[PDB]
Amino acid sequence: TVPDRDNDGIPDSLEVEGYTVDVKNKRTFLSPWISNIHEKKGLTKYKSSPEKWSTASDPYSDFEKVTGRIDKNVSPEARHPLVAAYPIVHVDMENIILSKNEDSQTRTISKNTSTSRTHTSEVHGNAEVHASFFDIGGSVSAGFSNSNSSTVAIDHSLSLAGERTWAETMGLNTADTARLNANIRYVNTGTAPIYNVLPTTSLVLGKNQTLATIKAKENQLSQILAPNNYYPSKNLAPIALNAQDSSTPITMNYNQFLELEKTKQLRLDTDQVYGNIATYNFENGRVRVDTGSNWSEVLPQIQETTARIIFNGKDLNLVERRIAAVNPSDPLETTKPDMTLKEALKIAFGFNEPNGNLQYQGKDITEFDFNFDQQTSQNIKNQLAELNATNIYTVLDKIKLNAKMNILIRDKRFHYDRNNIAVGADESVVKEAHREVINSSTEGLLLNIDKDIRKILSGYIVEIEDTEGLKEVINDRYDMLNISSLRQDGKTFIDFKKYNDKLPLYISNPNYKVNVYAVTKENTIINPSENGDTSTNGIKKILIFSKKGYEIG
Amino acid sequence: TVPDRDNDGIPDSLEVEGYTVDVKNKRTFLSPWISNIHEKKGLTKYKSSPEKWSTASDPYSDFEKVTGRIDKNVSPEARHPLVAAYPIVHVDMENIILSKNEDSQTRTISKNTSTSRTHTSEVHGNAEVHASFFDIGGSVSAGFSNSNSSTVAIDHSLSLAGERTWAETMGLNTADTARLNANIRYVNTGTAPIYNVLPTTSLVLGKNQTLATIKAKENQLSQILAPNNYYPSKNLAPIALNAQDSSTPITMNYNQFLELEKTKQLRLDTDQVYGNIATYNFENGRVRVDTGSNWSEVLPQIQETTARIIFNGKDLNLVERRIAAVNPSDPLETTKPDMTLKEALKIAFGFNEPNGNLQYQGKDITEFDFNFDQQTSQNIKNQLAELNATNIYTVLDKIKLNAKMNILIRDKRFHYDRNNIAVGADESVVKEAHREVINSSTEGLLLNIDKDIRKILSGYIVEIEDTEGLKEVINDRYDMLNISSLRQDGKTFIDFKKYNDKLPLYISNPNYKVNVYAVTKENTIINPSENGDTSTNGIKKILIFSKKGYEIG
Ligand SMILES: [Ca+2]
Ligand SMILES: [Ca+2]
Ligand SMILES: [Ca+2]
Ligand SMILES: [Ca+2]
């Protein structure tokens, strides 16, 4: 009569004091922690709640997880009892194509786009918010809350000849209407797979101008949207918007269009209506989809009993993950094991302990900026109070975590915008990343630029300095910055030629200086100034390259 | 064979005499009250009925609640056995847009709106009511009864240039028809979440002119309408009326329109057809939606066995909550624990006992006005009789509560209208709240105005007094009061500039007086007098600011 209140399979004693699953001959034993023999083999000290089926609340029993008798598609780190295993799906727009609503073969602009999961944070301290902002639950979005929003930025450069004025290039006048079309793909950033129904993501423009809502039919798809995997597998045909399937295309009047040309960006607000869930079956050991248990029902619970932490180390992409945090008010939830901001980061993402420090694959914890909400803030400030210390990174392994807590560990190296996106770092860094020259030619530059940094650079600027001090720039236009291409060999490649009429640079005197600059996204522009200054005049460029002419080719 | 008639899980003895749930190691124990050790740890003395599953009648077992093995979305205070845990959803209209039913880019008026849950109370003592008002159950609305009604007020100010006459601004004549459109969002004020089906709320105008009934399709939504949470999360795209989804727009003939322009307000009568309910499952511990148990069935019961109290402390918003009140006639309902108007207020909202007094987060109970219905009135008056006392606030912890009883505890500081809405307080208060000046400029005023009070002020008036006694007002129009904007830093900001042509004030003599007044909603007007007096002449303004010219900038 071994005690098991949750009836999960893991006896209370274990679930509460500690345990781990291990394999003897070929069989697997669920044994209690043994600092002696266990820590050696490499196992893990699993500690869950004895009174809950799945301590996270997600559709997977603490037993099912640790043991491995679960939907193999569930994320690894989510295989751990205190790591919420749910989906997180947003939409990526690879590129778009704009034209005139119905001899139309050269009257169109097809430019690419860059999309990223956004995490819109509150304003400054003087926004005209309605008097309902200071009420309970109402308007108090508290910085960041549950929901999906991806922001697309459209390529401002040039694709054709010497094209100019998006408007005329298409042939648009106050009495015309421009139609939009694009290629997108759903992408699951979460820790659990979606099996059928897809999110009814809507495309917004500006602040509330809903351009269209894509709700690609249900069950039409049987392909799985596994964690870290794009809907139509990156090696397949992306989904196109209002390009087939649909009788009502996309309408965008003049005024609206102008705005698009003004910011050259859109937003993708996606809901959470994911499909039913795939559950295990102890009987035959097959994973099936329970037409009864659908995420929309099981998600809230997770969200109401987990510490959520957003992090961007793996890549400058925001990653969400929830940990099994406790809660004073809820007796049951007070059964969940105690959570430390340290341990959280260890299993929630991957941080580890080398020789005593807490770093994330090299980068030390101290290299990231912690961000919370009003609630979480206090709840922590008050813990630092009763522990006497000002530098949190010290007591990091003593900061208790409670459910409903929201955290945002981000890389300190870069600057971020409203949507907490990487926008560009300090000079000291940008240079430090270009300190590797491979091939110097009058055609371009080949470097071993750091995959990360480069993601914060709009483009480059190439000029030539006279022996006395001149400023002649080859690509002298706001939209002639797009030059750095990326080879699959893992090396960034610049090309002066693309914007010099197929022909290489011009060395008037092999004693001159060939300058190349980088333009961070936060400093780069997308349109001519008030007048019509279409030149790299008023730009905050950066000294990336500066070698003589006899040191190239 | 421990006795459990309700078969809930809590043994009679406990349920009747007292108990509380607590956590030992990581397990949770359901133990009886122990004034000694319990009161210390901070637990609560739970006392429910031994013969009822859920003493409130709501879909949640007394056990499920106290223990926490329930839909995590259920409100906290409703986690207590004697606090009805049901939904309460009304509709908020952020703003509207009026035009002429079909070169229409400058022939429209888009003004914002302010909506609030109303609690329409009876008339005075001379209303022409049909002879059926004094019958049983018939017409005896008894002051306030179950149902949802939200009142919207439309911004009367100006948005464009020097616009005038709503009629002509759109181009309306006896032979034309104006169409309406607006953005709204459902909002759940209750204590329990709705999971799918949404209320068939209808938009009324005046007294019975049903403008349109919005019944946004069922199951189309899977997003949850949690307690204190707006339908499309405040951080999302509000729902628009007859703007897509719909073939029959909104029609409003001349006569009707005029009325709108006359009171500039509408009403939103919403039903209670909420969705099915989310119930817990002891087995695996998952929360699912029982296609069998739908609120429409489970609500009545609550309503017929609970003391309902409306309160507005959290904010000047009416909050409804029901407590497990007893009932003499019903044997079963006579099993419910005894309820005191004190305890009720303690768990129903949050009132507590500091050093012996009963206050609600600072404000003392004595600062609110108690309001009942004919029935509840007597039932209490008769309790004061057999207890010899005239001041109720004394015997507050001795006023028994019976089911079907209706109560309305409201803040005494302000004045209220028909719908029991905050409309404006006494002078002594308005001033007291503006006793904090931060930045004085010839452009505007920055103050630390109390979030609460400000919610009762239509706008401000700015004039200049000569050294002898002149009355020159900058913004001298009924609709030029809208000036106080609110910064997210938590400070109210006034702007003289908005109504002085972008340019700051004019100090003819730095020894003059710069006056600023506030206009309470109850005193403010929305249209020109009989003739055409579009000036702040006949208005009951209030002395808010009065500083010299050399004490500003
Ligand atoms: Ca267990
Ligand atoms: Ca368990
Ligand atoms: Ca019982
Ligand atoms: Ca009971």
Q: What is the CATH number of the domain that holds A104?
A: 2.60.120.240
Are A126 and A79 part of one and the same domain? no
| Element (DSSP H or E) covering residue A13 | helix A12-17
Q: Which of A251, A306, A332, A338 to mutate to test the interface with B (most CBs of B within 10 A)?
A: A332
Which DSSP state fits A402? B
Any idea of the CA torsion for B54, B60, B66, B71, to the nearest 10 degrees? 180
A295-298 long-range contacts, Cβ below 8 Å, gap at least 24? A295/A86, A295/A87, A295/A194, A296/A272, A296/B222, A296/B223, A296/B224, A297/B195, A297/B278, A297/B286, A297/B287, A297/B288, A297/B289, A298/A57, A298/A58, A298/A59, A298/A86, A298/B286, A298/B287
Q: Looking at B244-287, which runs of residues are DSSP E strands? A: 265-270, 276-279
Are A327 and A363 part of one and the same domain? yes
Q: Are A20 and A44 in contact (CB under 8 A)?
A: yes
Q: Which of B113, B185, B186, B235 to mutate to test the interface with A (most CBs of A within 10 A)?
A: B235
HSE (CB half, 13 Å, CA atoms) of B471?
Answer: 6
Beta-sheet pairing, A307-311 with A406-411: parallel
Q: Residue A417 and residue B196: Cα distance in Å, rounded?
A: 36
Are B95 and B66 part of one and the same domain? no
Nearby residues for ligand 1 (ion, Cβ within 5 Å): A 4, 6, 8, 10, 15, 50
Q: Chain A: give the shortest CA distance to residue B458, in Å.
A: 12
Are B392 and B459 part of one and the same domain? no
Residue B192 CA from chain centroid, whole number: 17
**Phi, psi at A19, each rounded to 5°:** -165, 180
Per-residue exposure over B311-347, b if at least 16 CB sit within 10 Å of its own CB, e if not:
bbbebbbbbbbbbbbbbeeeeebebbbebbbbbbbbb
Q: Residue A517 and residue A512: Cα distance in Å, rounded?
A: 16
> Residues B88, B94, B99, B104: is their CA dihedral positive or negative?
negative
Residues of A with CB below 8 A from B493's CB?
126
Maximum alpha-carbon separation in chain B = 92
Beta-sheet pairing, A209-213 with A202-205: antiparallel
Whole-number Å distance, alpha carbon A62 to ligand 2 midpoint, is 6
Are A292 and A314 part of one and the same domain? no
Kindly give, in sequence order, each residue whose CB lies less than 8 Å from that of residue B264, ignoring residues fewer than 6 positions away.
B153, B154, B156, B526
Listed residue (B7, B87, B77, B72) closest to B46, CA to CA: B77
Residue A457 CA from chain centroid, whole number: 17
Residue A249 CA from chain centroid, whole number: 30
Which DSSP state fits B488? T
Q: Chain A: give the shortest CA distance to residue B233, in Å.
A: 9
Provide the β-strand partners of residue A311.
Answer: A319, A409
* Helix segments in A310-450, DSSP class H: 341-348, 374-385, 427-433
Of B22, B278, B489, the CB nearest to A125: B489
What DSSP string describes B85-107? ----EEEEEEEEEEEE----SSS
Provide the β-strand partners of residue A210.
Answer: A204
Q: Chain A: give the shortest CA distance to residue B45, in Å.
A: 14
Q: What is the CATH number of the domain that holds A380?
A: 3.10.20.110
Are B529 and B380 part of one and the same domain? no
**Cα–Cα–Cα angle for A383, A388, A392, nearest 5°?**
65
Q: Are A442 and A553 in contact (CB under 8 A)?
A: yes
Q: How many helices (H) and strands (E) does chain B have?
A: 9, 29
Are B406 and B482 part of one and the same domain? no
Are B131 and B72 part of one and the same domain? no
Of B25, B278, B486, the CB nearest to A131: B486
Are A195 and A227 part of one and the same domain? yes
Helix, strand, or coil (residue B502) = coil
Residue numbers in the known binding site of B are: 4, 6, 8, 10, 15, 49, 52, 62
Q: How far is CA A538 from CA A180, A459, A478, A501, A534, in A?
A: 32, 15, 9, 24, 10
Q: Are B61 and B9 in contact (CB under 8 A)?
A: yes
Are B141 and B265 part of one and the same domain? yes
Of B230, B233, B315, the CB nearest to A136: B315
Listed residue (B345, B336, B304) closest to B47, CA to CA: B336
| Element (DSSP H or E) covering residue B203 | strand B202-205
Beta-sheet pairing, B307-311 with B406-411: parallel
Q: How many helices (H) and strands (E) does chain A have?
A: 9, 29
Q: What is the CATH number of the domain that holds B457?
A: 2.60.40.810
Residues of B with CB below 8 A from A335's CB?
23, 26-28
Query: Whole domain around residue A450: which residue ranges?
Result: 423-553
Q: How far is CA B486 from CA A125, A144, A208, A249, B549, in A?
A: 10, 21, 21, 41, 25
| Element (DSSP H or E) covering residue A12 | helix A12-17
Q: What is the resolution of this structure in A?
A: 3.6
Six token digits for residue A202: 């809507």
B488:A129 CB<8 A: yes
Residue that terminates a domain, selected from A422, A449, A476: A422
Q: Residue B130 and residue B27: Cα distance in Å, rounded?
A: 63
Are A95 and A54 part of one and the same domain? no
Q: Residue B277 and residue B71: Cα distance in Å, rounded?
A: 10
Are B191 and B125 part of one and the same domain? yes
Q: How far is CA A31 from CA A20, A70, A363, B304, in A?
A: 6, 19, 34, 54
Number of domains in chain B: 4
Residue that terminates a domain, selected from A303, A330, A356: A303
What DSSP string describes A188-217? E-SSS-B-S-----EEEETTTEEEEE----
Q: Chain A: give the shortest CA distance to residue B386, in Å.
A: 40
Six token digits for residue A141: 């979005």
Residue that terminates a domain, selected from B356, B388, B422: B422
Any idea of the CA torsion for A25, A28, A32, A33, to the nearest 10 degrees? 70
